[PDB]
Each structure stands twice: as C-alpha cells, then as structure tokens.
C-alpha cells in the first residue's frame, strides 16, 4: 500500500519549522500550511508551533546556539607564545650527524650519512649479511680525529 510512502514524509519531520517568527506567528504559518483556519469557531489564541526562534531553554536563536557557543569559546584566547625577557637555553651541536651525533670518530656530514657510514662498522644494515666479497680491500685502517685513513 502506497499509504505508507505517503505516510513517511510526515514522520521524517516532526519538528515542522519553516521560518523564524514568534510562537504565535509560527502557529499561523503552520495553520496556513496544514489547512485553512479562516474564521474558525474556536478561539485558538494560546496555541504554539515549534520554531527556530527558540531553543530548549527559551532562548532566542539569532544564530544556531551551537555555533554561538563555539564562537564564544574563542573569546578566551590570550597571546599564544609571547616570551619577552632574554633566556639562556643552550643545545648540543646541530649539524654533524644528529641521530647519535657522531659515532666511530670519523668525520660525518648529513644525517643520512651517518647511517650510511655506520654500515661499514656493521650493525646498521650490515652485521655479516650472509655473504661478503671475502677478500675485502684496504685491510688496515688507521683512524683518529686528526686523520681518518686507509
């Protein structure tokens, strides 16, 4: 039965709110929408119709009370991070190999480069990975801060 589909459109909106007038006006609007309340017997004078003019608290919704509340909260913001006196907050060196900040003495560059150098000292992707060139070059490597040499 078609009766159901038709039915459903009412159900969907149980708060018929068209415009934003006072309670009495909303009542007239829904009346004219619904039927024709033209010189009716009964004295309808007290009757009211749900409207966007009010909330659940009897307050006048200028703009949806939620949106008001959220914009109102923004009121309560001072100046983020304004620091005025001079501080003394130092740091360990930022540039040479800043994942450990140098390892194995030898000179480093980029942060990548550390990982990439580290590899030759094993651990970092190179702790005897099944195979090798066997007879690897250089043999001897004389290392120190003043000379890194093979």
mmCIF file of C-alpha atoms in Angstrom:
data_model
loop_
_atom_site.group_PDB
_atom_site.id
_atom_site.type_symbol
_atom_site.label_atom_id
_atom_site.label_comp_id
_atom_site.label_asym_id
_atom_site.label_seq_id
_atom_site.Cartn_x
_atom_site.Cartn_y
_atom_site.Cartn_z
ATOM 1 C CA UNK A 1 0.000 0.000 0.000
ATOM 2 C CA UNK A 2 1.024 3.385 -1.190
ATOM 3 C CA UNK A 3 -0.364 4.694 2.015
ATOM 4 C CA UNK A 4 2.971 4.052 3.699
ATOM 5 C CA UNK A 5 5.281 6.037 1.429
ATOM 6 C CA UNK A 6 2.981 8.972 1.772
ATOM 7 C CA UNK A 7 2.907 8.387 5.462
ATOM 8 C CA UNK A 8 6.607 8.593 5.806
ATOM 9 C CA UNK A 9 7.111 12.228 4.788
ATOM 10 C CA UNK A 10 5.389 13.463 7.906
ATOM 11 C CA UNK A 11 7.268 11.068 10.165
ATOM 12 C CA UNK A 12 10.603 12.302 8.844
ATOM 13 C CA UNK A 13 9.989 15.790 10.279
ATOM 14 C CA UNK A 14 8.348 16.008 13.463
ATOM 15 C CA UNK A 15 9.574 19.475 14.059
ATOM 16 C CA UNK A 16 7.883 21.496 11.249
ATOM 17 C CA UNK A 17 9.838 24.676 11.356
ATOM 18 C CA UNK A 18 9.511 26.894 8.264
ATOM 19 C CA UNK A 19 10.662 30.368 9.277
ATOM 20 C CA UNK A 20 11.753 32.343 12.366
ATOM 21 C CA UNK A 21 8.891 34.243 13.981
ATOM 22 C CA UNK A 22 7.475 34.376 17.414
ATOM 23 C CA UNK A 23 5.461 31.466 18.773
ATOM 24 C CA UNK A 24 2.130 32.879 17.746
ATOM 25 C CA UNK A 25 3.160 33.574 14.192
ATOM 26 C CA UNK A 26 4.682 30.143 13.734
ATOM 27 C CA UNK A 27 1.283 28.905 14.745
ATOM 28 C CA UNK A 28 -0.357 30.869 11.990
ATOM 29 C CA UNK A 29 2.151 29.765 9.401
ATOM 30 C CA UNK A 30 1.726 26.080 10.157
ATOM 31 C CA UNK A 31 -2.042 26.587 10.073
ATOM 32 C CA UNK A 32 -1.987 28.038 6.607
ATOM 33 C CA UNK A 33 0.369 25.232 5.585
ATOM 34 C CA UNK A 34 -1.695 22.438 7.081
ATOM 35 C CA UNK A 35 -5.301 23.675 6.362
ATOM 36 C CA UNK A 36 -7.440 26.810 6.111
ATOM 37 C CA UNK A 37 -8.036 28.377 9.501
ATOM 38 C CA UNK A 38 -10.196 31.119 8.133
ATOM 39 C CA UNK A 39 -12.841 32.381 10.535
ATOM 40 C CA UNK A 40 -12.774 29.261 12.675
ATOM 41 C CA UNK A 41 -15.206 28.830 15.526
ATOM 42 C CA UNK A 42 -12.666 28.043 18.148
ATOM 43 C CA UNK A 43 -10.503 30.640 19.815
ATOM 44 C CA UNK A 44 -7.056 29.233 19.085
ATOM 45 C CA UNK A 45 -5.211 32.081 20.731
ATOM 46 C CA UNK A 46 -2.953 30.234 23.016
ATOM 47 C CA UNK A 47 -1.685 27.671 20.570
ATOM 48 C CA UNK A 48 2.037 27.471 19.592
ATOM 49 C CA UNK A 49 4.120 25.860 16.901
ATOM 50 C CA UNK A 50 7.770 24.761 17.005
ATOM 51 C CA UNK A 51 10.075 27.357 15.512
ATOM 52 C CA UNK A 52 13.757 28.213 15.032
ATOM 53 C CA UNK A 53 13.192 31.362 17.067
ATOM 54 C CA UNK A 54 13.698 29.303 20.265
ATOM 55 C CA UNK A 55 15.782 26.540 21.861
ATOM 56 C CA UNK A 56 15.222 24.044 24.643
ATOM 57 C CA UNK A 57 15.843 26.808 27.145
ATOM 58 C CA UNK A 58 13.503 29.559 25.863
ATOM 59 C CA UNK A 59 16.336 31.469 24.311
ATOM 60 C CA UNK A 60 16.247 33.418 21.049
ATOM 61 C CA UNK A 61 18.308 31.856 18.360
ATOM 62 C CA UNK A 62 19.888 34.634 16.450
ATOM 63 C CA UNK A 63 22.247 32.125 15.026
ATOM 64 C CA UNK A 64 22.214 28.372 15.903
ATOM 65 C CA UNK A 65 23.092 28.237 19.615
ATOM 66 C CA UNK A 66 25.775 25.681 18.995
ATOM 67 C CA UNK A 67 27.613 27.958 16.593
ATOM 68 C CA UNK A 68 27.328 30.738 19.082
ATOM 69 C CA UNK A 69 28.775 28.694 21.811
ATOM 70 C CA UNK A 70 31.753 27.565 19.753
ATOM 71 C CA UNK A 71 32.495 31.076 18.539
ATOM 72 C CA UNK A 72 32.073 32.408 22.046
ATOM 73 C CA UNK A 73 34.685 29.993 23.393
ATOM 74 C CA UNK A 74 37.214 31.571 21.039
ATOM 75 C CA UNK A 75 36.860 34.738 23.180
ATOM 76 C CA UNK A 76 39.062 33.099 25.820
ATOM 77 C CA UNK A 77 42.355 33.191 23.970
ATOM 78 C CA UNK A 78 45.381 35.240 25.077
ATOM 79 C CA UNK A 79 48.570 35.742 23.123
ATOM 80 C CA UNK A 80 49.888 32.330 22.269
ATOM 81 C CA UNK A 81 53.583 32.316 22.914
ATOM 82 C CA UNK A 82 54.982 35.732 23.632
ATOM 83 C CA UNK A 83 58.149 35.454 25.582
ATOM 84 C CA UNK A 84 59.820 38.769 26.449
ATOM 85 C CA UNK A 85 62.797 38.500 28.835
ATOM 86 C CA UNK A 86 66.040 37.045 27.442
ATOM 87 C CA UNK A 87 66.591 33.322 28.110
ATOM 88 C CA UNK A 88 69.687 31.136 28.211
ATOM 89 C CA UNK A 89 68.676 27.734 26.780
ATOM 90 C CA UNK A 90 71.533 26.140 25.013
ATOM 91 C CA UNK A 91 71.874 22.941 22.952
ATOM 92 C CA UNK A 92 74.324 20.190 21.843
ATOM 93 C CA UNK A 93 75.550 20.732 18.268
ATOM 94 C CA UNK A 94 73.013 20.569 15.490
ATOM 95 C CA UNK A 95 74.543 19.688 12.099
ATOM 96 C CA UNK A 96 77.116 16.840 12.341
ATOM 97 C CA UNK A 97 75.280 13.544 12.366
ATOM 98 C CA UNK A 98 72.377 14.229 14.673
ATOM 99 C CA UNK A 99 70.939 10.777 15.094
ATOM 100 C CA UNK A 100 73.801 9.951 17.553
ATOM 101 C CA UNK A 101 75.896 12.960 16.982
ATOM 102 C CA UNK A 102 78.886 11.202 15.664
ATOM 103 C CA UNK A 103 79.712 7.500 16.335
ATOM 104 C CA UNK A 104 83.029 5.998 15.268
ATOM 105 C CA UNK A 105 85.191 9.080 15.475
ATOM 106 C CA UNK A 106 85.480 9.603 11.766
ATOM 107 C CA UNK A 107 84.083 12.749 10.320
ATOM 108 C CA UNK A 108 80.413 12.872 9.395
ATOM 109 C CA UNK A 109 78.113 15.039 7.320
ATOM 110 C CA UNK A 110 74.362 14.699 6.655
ATOM 111 C CA UNK A 111 72.128 12.702 8.991
ATOM 112 C CA UNK A 112 71.739 10.131 6.234
ATOM 113 C CA UNK A 113 75.438 9.982 6.032
ATOM 114 C CA UNK A 114 75.702 8.648 9.483
ATOM 115 C CA UNK A 115 73.529 5.650 8.699
ATOM 116 C CA UNK A 116 75.401 5.173 5.549
ATOM 117 C CA UNK A 117 78.833 5.336 7.246
ATOM 118 C CA UNK A 118 77.581 3.235 10.138
ATOM 119 C CA UNK A 119 77.038 0.463 7.737
ATOM 120 C CA UNK A 120 80.742 -0.124 7.363
ATOM 121 C CA UNK A 121 81.082 -0.586 11.037
ATOM 122 C CA UNK A 122 78.304 -3.206 10.859
ATOM 123 C CA UNK A 123 75.082 -3.064 12.914
ATOM 124 C CA UNK A 124 73.406 -0.644 10.617
ATOM 125 C CA UNK A 125 72.110 -2.911 7.924
ATOM 126 C CA UNK A 126 75.416 -4.816 7.740
ATOM 127 C CA UNK A 127 76.176 -7.287 10.503
ATOM 128 C CA UNK A 128 77.607 -10.030 8.303
ATOM 129 C CA UNK A 129 74.744 -10.347 5.910
ATOM 130 C CA UNK A 130 75.252 -13.914 4.838
ATOM 131 C CA UNK A 131 77.871 -13.006 2.201
ATOM 132 C CA UNK A 132 80.833 -10.743 1.519
ATOM 133 C CA UNK A 133 83.469 -10.020 -1.101
ATOM 134 C CA UNK A 134 85.629 -12.362 1.006
ATOM 135 C CA UNK A 135 88.915 -10.676 0.458
ATOM 136 C CA UNK A 136 87.917 -7.143 1.082
ATOM 137 C CA UNK A 137 90.083 -4.079 0.245
ATOM 138 C CA UNK A 138 92.160 -1.648 2.388
ATOM 139 C CA UNK A 139 92.929 -4.216 5.038
ATOM 140 C CA UNK A 140 94.303 -1.789 7.629
ATOM 141 C CA UNK A 141 92.612 1.485 8.654
ATOM 142 C CA UNK A 142 94.464 3.988 10.817
ATOM 143 C CA UNK A 143 91.764 6.118 12.422
ATOM 144 C CA UNK A 144 91.772 9.225 14.627
ATOM 145 C CA UNK A 145 90.322 12.685 14.915
ATOM 146 C CA UNK A 146 93.285 14.242 13.128
ATOM 147 C CA UNK A 147 93.491 11.666 10.322
ATOM 148 C CA UNK A 148 90.967 9.144 9.048
ATOM 149 C CA UNK A 149 92.878 6.867 6.770
ATOM 150 C CA UNK A 150 93.172 3.606 4.956
#
